[PDB]
Coordinates of C-alpha atoms and ligand atoms in Angstrom, one line a residue:
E27 CA 18.7 5.1 -16.9
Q28 CA 20.3 1.8 -17.8
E29 CA 18.7 0.3 -20.9
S30 CA 18.1 -2.6 -18.7
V31 CA 15.7 -0.7 -16.4
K32 CA 14.0 0.9 -19.4
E33 CA 13.4 -2.3 -21.1
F34 CA 12.2 -3.9 -17.7
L35 CA 9.6 -1.1 -17.2
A36 CA 8.5 -1.2 -20.9
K37 CA 7.6 -4.8 -20.4
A38 CA 6.1 -4.2 -17.1
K39 CA 3.8 -1.5 -18.7
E40 CA 2.9 -3.8 -21.6
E41 CA 1.8 -6.6 -19.3
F42 CA -0.1 -4.2 -17.0
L43 CA -1.9 -2.6 -20.0
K44 CA -3.1 -5.9 -21.4
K45 CA -4.9 -6.9 -18.1
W46 CA -6.0 -3.2 -17.5
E47 CA -7.8 -3.3 -20.8
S48 CA -9.4 -6.7 -20.3
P49 CA -9.9 -7.2 -16.6
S50 CA -10.6 -10.5 -14.9
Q51 CA -14.0 -10.9 -13.3
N52 CA -16.0 -13.5 -11.4
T53 CA -13.2 -16.0 -10.8
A54 CA -14.5 -17.7 -7.5
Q55 CA -17.6 -17.6 -5.3
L56 CA -18.2 -17.3 -1.6
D57 CA -19.1 -20.9 -0.9
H58 CA -15.6 -22.0 -2.2
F59 CA -14.2 -20.9 1.0
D60 CA -14.5 -21.5 4.9
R61 CA -14.3 -18.4 7.2
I62 CA -11.5 -18.6 9.7
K63 CA -11.2 -15.2 11.5
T64 CA -11.7 -11.4 11.1
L65 CA -8.3 -9.7 10.5
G66 CA -9.4 -6.1 10.2
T67 CA -12.7 -4.1 9.8
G68 CA -13.6 -0.6 8.6
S69 CA -16.5 1.7 7.8
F70 CA -17.5 -0.2 4.6
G71 CA -15.7 -3.5 4.6
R72 CA -13.5 -6.0 6.4
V73 CA -10.7 -8.5 5.7
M74 CA -11.2 -12.1 6.6
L75 CA -8.8 -15.1 6.8
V76 CA -10.4 -17.7 4.6
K77 CA -9.5 -21.2 3.6
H78 CA -10.3 -22.6 0.1
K79 CA -12.2 -25.9 0.6
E80 CA -10.8 -27.8 -2.2
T81 CA -7.0 -26.7 -2.2
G82 CA -6.7 -26.0 1.4
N83 CA -4.9 -22.7 0.7
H84 CA -5.4 -19.7 3.0
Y85 CA -6.3 -16.2 1.6
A86 CA -7.1 -12.8 3.0
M87 CA -10.5 -11.9 1.7
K88 CA -11.6 -8.3 1.6
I89 CA -15.3 -7.9 1.6
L90 CA -16.9 -4.7 0.8
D91 CA -20.6 -3.8 1.4
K92 CA -21.9 -2.3 -1.8
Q93 CA -24.5 -0.2 0.0
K94 CA -21.9 1.4 2.3
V95 CA -19.4 1.9 -0.5
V96 CA -22.1 4.0 -2.3
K97 CA -23.1 5.9 1.0
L98 CA -19.5 6.8 1.7
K99 CA -18.8 7.8 -2.0
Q100 CA -16.2 5.1 -2.6
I101 CA -17.6 3.6 -5.8
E102 CA -14.9 4.8 -8.2
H103 CA -12.2 3.9 -5.6
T104 CA -13.4 0.4 -5.2
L105 CA -13.5 -0.1 -9.0
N106 CA -10.0 1.4 -9.2
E107 CA -8.7 -1.0 -6.5
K108 CA -9.9 -4.1 -8.1
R109 CA -9.0 -3.1 -11.6
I110 CA -5.5 -2.1 -10.6
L111 CA -4.9 -5.1 -8.3
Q112 CA -5.8 -7.6 -11.1
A113 CA -3.4 -6.0 -13.5
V114 CA -0.2 -5.4 -11.5
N115 CA 2.7 -7.8 -10.9
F116 CA 5.7 -6.9 -8.6
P117 CA 7.5 -8.7 -5.9
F118 CA 6.5 -6.2 -3.1
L119 CA 2.7 -6.1 -4.0
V120 CA 0.2 -8.5 -2.6
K121 CA -1.3 -10.7 -5.3
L122 CA -5.0 -10.8 -6.1
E123 CA -6.0 -14.4 -6.5
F124 CA -9.7 -14.2 -7.2
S125 CA -12.5 -11.6 -7.3
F126 CA -16.3 -11.8 -7.5
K127 CA -19.5 -10.1 -6.3
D128 CA -22.8 -11.1 -5.1
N129 CA -26.2 -9.4 -4.3
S130 CA -24.6 -7.6 -1.3
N131 CA -20.8 -7.5 -1.4
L132 CA -17.7 -7.1 -3.4
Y133 CA -14.8 -9.7 -2.8
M134 CA -11.1 -9.5 -3.4
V135 CA -9.4 -12.7 -2.5
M136 CA -5.6 -12.0 -2.0
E137 CA -2.6 -13.9 -0.8
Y138 CA -2.5 -14.1 3.0
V139 CA 0.7 -12.7 4.7
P140 CA 1.0 -14.2 8.2
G141 CA 3.7 -11.9 9.5
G142 CA 1.3 -9.1 10.2
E143 CA 1.5 -5.2 9.6
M144 CA 4.7 -3.3 9.9
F145 CA 2.8 -1.1 12.2
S146 CA 2.6 -3.8 14.9
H147 CA 6.3 -4.7 14.6
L148 CA 7.3 -1.0 14.7
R149 CA 5.2 -0.3 17.8
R150 CA 6.4 -3.4 19.6
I151 CA 10.1 -2.6 19.1
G152 CA 9.8 1.2 19.3
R153 CA 11.9 2.2 16.3
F154 CA 13.8 0.5 13.5
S155 CA 17.6 1.0 13.1
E156 CA 18.6 2.9 10.0
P157 CA 19.7 -0.2 8.1
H158 CA 16.3 -1.9 9.1
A159 CA 14.3 1.2 7.9
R160 CA 16.5 1.4 4.7
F161 CA 15.7 -2.2 3.8
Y162 CA 11.9 -1.6 3.8
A163 CA 12.3 1.9 2.3
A164 CA 14.3 0.5 -0.7
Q165 CA 11.4 -1.9 -1.4
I166 CA 9.0 1.0 -1.3
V167 CA 11.2 3.0 -3.7
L168 CA 11.2 0.2 -6.2
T169 CA 7.5 -0.4 -5.8
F170 CA 6.7 3.3 -6.5
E171 CA 9.2 3.3 -9.5
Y172 CA 7.1 0.4 -10.9
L173 CA 3.6 1.9 -10.1
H174 CA 4.5 5.4 -11.2
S175 CA 5.8 4.1 -14.5
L176 CA 2.2 2.5 -15.1
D177 CA 0.7 5.9 -14.3
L178 CA -0.5 4.7 -10.9
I179 CA -0.5 6.7 -7.8
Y180 CA -0.8 4.7 -4.6
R181 CA -2.0 7.4 -2.1
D182 CA -2.1 5.3 1.0
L183 CA 1.4 4.6 2.2
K184 CA 1.5 4.0 6.0
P185 CA 2.8 1.2 8.2
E186 CA -0.6 -0.5 8.6
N187 CA -0.6 -1.2 4.8
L188 CA 2.7 -2.8 4.7
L189 CA 2.7 -6.6 5.6
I190 CA 5.8 -8.5 6.5
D191 CA 6.1 -11.9 4.7
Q192 CA 7.7 -15.1 5.6
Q193 CA 11.1 -13.9 4.2
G194 CA 10.9 -10.6 6.1
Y195 CA 10.1 -8.5 2.9
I196 CA 7.3 -6.1 2.5
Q197 CA 4.0 -6.8 0.7
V198 CA 2.0 -3.6 0.0
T199 CA -1.7 -4.1 0.6
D200 CA -4.8 -2.0 0.4
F201 CA -5.2 -0.4 -3.0
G202 CA -8.4 1.4 -1.9
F203 CA -7.0 4.8 -2.9
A204 CA -4.8 3.8 -5.9
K205 CA -5.7 5.4 -9.1
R206 CA -4.4 5.5 -12.8
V207 CA -3.7 9.2 -13.3
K208 CA -2.0 10.9 -16.3
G209 CA -1.3 14.3 -15.1
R210 CA -3.2 15.5 -11.9
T211 CA -6.0 14.2 -9.7
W212 CA -8.0 16.0 -7.0
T213 CA -9.6 13.6 -4.5
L214 CA -9.1 14.2 -0.7
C215 CA -7.9 10.9 0.6
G216 CA -5.2 9.2 2.5
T217 CA -4.5 9.4 6.2
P218 CA -3.8 12.7 7.9
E219 CA -0.3 12.1 9.1
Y220 CA 0.9 11.1 5.6
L221 CA -0.9 13.7 3.5
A222 CA 1.3 15.9 1.3
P223 CA 0.7 19.7 1.5
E224 CA -0.9 19.8 -1.9
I225 CA -3.6 17.4 -0.8
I226 CA -4.4 19.5 2.4
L227 CA -4.5 22.6 0.2
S228 CA -7.0 21.0 -2.3
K229 CA -4.7 21.3 -5.3
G230 CA -4.5 19.1 -8.4
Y231 CA -1.7 16.8 -7.4
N232 CA 0.4 14.0 -8.9
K233 CA 2.7 11.1 -8.0
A234 CA 4.8 13.5 -5.8
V235 CA 2.4 12.8 -3.0
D236 CA 3.7 9.3 -2.8
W237 CA 7.2 10.5 -2.5
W238 CA 6.2 12.9 0.3
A239 CA 4.5 9.9 2.0
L240 CA 7.7 7.9 1.8
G241 CA 9.5 10.7 3.6
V242 CA 6.8 10.4 6.4
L243 CA 7.2 6.6 6.5
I244 CA 11.0 6.7 6.7
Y245 CA 10.9 9.3 9.5
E246 CA 8.3 7.2 11.4
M247 CA 10.2 3.9 10.9
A248 CA 13.5 5.5 12.2
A249 CA 12.0 7.7 15.0
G250 CA 9.1 5.6 16.1
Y251 CA 6.6 8.4 15.5
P252 CA 5.7 10.5 12.5
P253 CA 7.1 13.9 11.8
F254 CA 3.9 16.0 12.0
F255 CA 2.3 14.5 15.1
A256 CA -0.7 16.2 16.9
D257 CA -4.0 15.4 18.7
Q258 CA -6.4 16.6 16.1
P259 CA -6.1 16.6 12.3
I260 CA -6.3 20.3 11.7
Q261 CA -3.2 20.7 14.0
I262 CA -1.4 18.0 12.0
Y263 CA -2.2 19.8 8.8
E264 CA -0.9 23.1 10.1
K265 CA 2.5 21.4 10.8
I266 CA 2.5 19.7 7.4
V267 CA 2.0 22.9 5.4
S268 CA 4.5 24.9 7.6
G269 CA 7.7 23.8 5.9
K270 CA 9.3 22.9 9.3
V271 CA 10.3 19.6 10.6
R272 CA 12.5 18.6 13.5
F273 CA 14.7 15.5 13.6
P274 CA 15.9 13.3 16.5
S275 CA 19.6 13.9 17.2
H276 CA 20.1 10.1 16.6
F277 CA 19.3 10.4 13.0
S278 CA 22.3 10.4 10.6
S279 CA 23.2 13.4 8.7
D280 CA 22.5 11.4 5.5
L281 CA 19.0 10.4 6.8
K282 CA 18.1 14.0 7.6
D283 CA 19.3 15.3 4.2
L284 CA 17.2 12.6 2.3
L285 CA 14.1 13.5 4.5
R286 CA 14.4 17.2 3.8
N287 CA 14.2 16.5 0.2
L288 CA 11.3 14.1 0.5
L289 CA 9.5 16.3 3.0
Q290 CA 9.8 19.3 0.7
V291 CA 6.6 21.3 0.8
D292 CA 7.2 22.7 -2.7
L293 CA 6.3 19.8 -4.9
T294 CA 8.3 21.1 -7.8
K295 CA 11.5 20.8 -5.6
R296 CA 10.6 17.3 -4.0
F297 CA 12.9 14.3 -4.7
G298 CA 11.1 11.9 -6.9
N299 CA 9.5 14.7 -8.8
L300 CA 12.5 16.3 -10.3
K301 CA 14.1 15.7 -13.8
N302 CA 16.1 12.7 -12.6
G303 CA 13.0 11.3 -11.0
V304 CA 13.6 8.3 -8.8
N305 CA 17.3 8.2 -9.3
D306 CA 17.7 11.3 -7.1
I307 CA 16.5 9.0 -4.3
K308 CA 18.3 5.8 -5.4
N309 CA 21.6 7.6 -5.7
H310 CA 21.3 9.4 -2.4
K311 CA 24.1 8.8 0.1
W312 CA 21.6 7.3 2.6
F313 CA 21.1 4.4 0.1
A314 CA 24.8 4.0 -0.7
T315 CA 24.8 0.5 0.9
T316 CA 21.7 -0.7 -1.0
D317 CA 22.1 -3.2 -3.9
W318 CA 18.9 -2.3 -5.7
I319 CA 18.9 -5.5 -7.9
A320 CA 19.5 -7.8 -5.0
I321 CA 16.6 -6.2 -3.2
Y322 CA 14.4 -6.7 -6.2
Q323 CA 15.6 -10.4 -6.5
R324 CA 14.9 -11.0 -2.9
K325 CA 18.5 -12.1 -2.4
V326 CA 19.2 -9.9 0.6
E327 CA 18.7 -11.4 4.1
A328 CA 16.0 -9.5 5.9
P329 CA 16.5 -7.6 9.2
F330 CA 14.0 -9.9 10.9
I331 CA 11.6 -12.7 10.1
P332 CA 8.2 -12.5 11.9
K333 CA 7.3 -15.2 14.3
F334 CA 4.5 -17.4 13.1
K335 CA 3.7 -21.0 13.2
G336 CA 2.4 -21.6 9.6
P337 CA 0.4 -20.2 6.7
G338 CA -2.9 -20.2 8.9
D339 CA -1.4 -18.6 11.9
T340 CA -3.2 -15.3 12.9
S341 CA -1.2 -14.5 16.0
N342 CA 0.3 -11.4 14.4
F343 CA -3.1 -9.9 13.8
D344 CA -5.5 -8.6 16.5
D345 CA -9.0 -9.7 17.7
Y346 CA -12.3 -8.2 16.3
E347 CA -15.8 -9.0 17.0
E348 CA -16.9 -11.8 14.5
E349 CA -19.9 -10.4 12.6
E350 CA -22.1 -12.1 9.9
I351 CA -21.3 -12.1 6.2
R352 CA -24.8 -11.8 4.9
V353 CA -25.9 -11.9 1.3
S354 CA -29.3 -10.3 0.5
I355 CA -31.9 -12.2 -1.5
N356 CA -32.1 -9.1 -3.6
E357 CA -29.4 -7.5 -5.8
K358 CA -28.1 -4.1 -4.4
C359 CA -26.4 -1.5 -6.4
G360 CA -26.0 -3.7 -9.4
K361 CA -25.6 -0.9 -11.9
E362 CA -22.9 1.0 -9.9
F363 CA -20.7 -2.2 -9.8
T364 CA -21.3 -3.6 -13.3
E365 CA -17.7 -3.5 -14.2
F366 CA -16.4 -5.4 -11.0
Ligands
LIG409 N1 -21.1 -19.7 5.4 S1 -21.3 -18.2 5.1 O1 -21.5 -17.5 6.3 O2 -22.2 -18.1 4.0 C1 -19.7 -17.8 4.5 C2 -19.2 -18.7 3.7 C3 -17.8 -18.5 3.3 C4 -17.4 -17.4 4.0 CL1 -15.8 -16.7 3.9 S2 -18.6 -16.6 5.0
LIG410 N1 21.5 -3.0 2.0 S1 19.9 -3.2 2.2 O1 19.5 -4.2 1.3 O2 19.3 -1.9 2.1 C1 19.7 -3.8 3.7 C2 19.9 -5.2 4.1 C3 19.7 -5.4 5.4 C4 19.5 -4.3 6.2 CL1 19.2 -4.2 7.8 S2 19.6 -2.8 5.1

């Protein structure tokens, strides 16, 4: 690769490792913020729009219930998420601004991206044109080049985790399954439609699973639906492992060729995992019109700009029951979360 890229990634890794080895901790507290609205909710946490009471800045605050994290066996994953997020720095990764914990919860306070999830925009419009999908895909390629060079696997690529910012660029959110891995790792995690065969088959897997997931994402962006769709997970899994995929006739030949190489069931033959690494993807004909440096520098005009009224607008997110954020009078699970 150009010495320019090598030197960029060497500096990126140096800066990551310094923060990785000495993580920040306890940089705000709950009563510094006002609660505005619930933006999303899951089995062990939720994401809230909050406003800092002194600066007036808006943030997305992810709140995890320590007791539910323990019960759902997510301890290590939550520690991964925060340690990684506080150490990374890249244009297409959502920035962690503060983190802290209390008797009941863990808190990660991130930049708020008011444009909403790619998922919503994709479902609204149906499918993205190839140029539109390519613009987003290029950002993911560069982001994975960055993450993988730091020995990080992302493991949760899907449209819901890609927010569209005020310039129409992607910000990857939700590092709940991200992990620093030299070699292989084994945990069953992700989301069914996006899982690589080697995850389904319980193998020791590596960063090639992220490149598989990129194939799924590109297909879904360009078609409007993912390639292995079914009513129940086990039926999805049978399609994934089969080695068969069908493409809409509207897909270009170049798109089909790239997707066959990303959706390669043999991980040793999958683009992104060969001797030329990411360059097999960056040099593919489907990306011939992409100026990789201009994308990184955010100099390309985006396909669209989400409609929103300002940094506190929640119109691109959906409505959830507003539940209490309670803090116990007694510390819970202190030992498990000492390093957070
Ligand atoms: N006021 S409270 O319910 O303790 C709460 C404070 C800040 C939040 Cl964000 S939620
Ligand atoms: N050429 S590119 O940066 O991938 C791109 C820009 C605008 C698109 Cl639509 S596709």
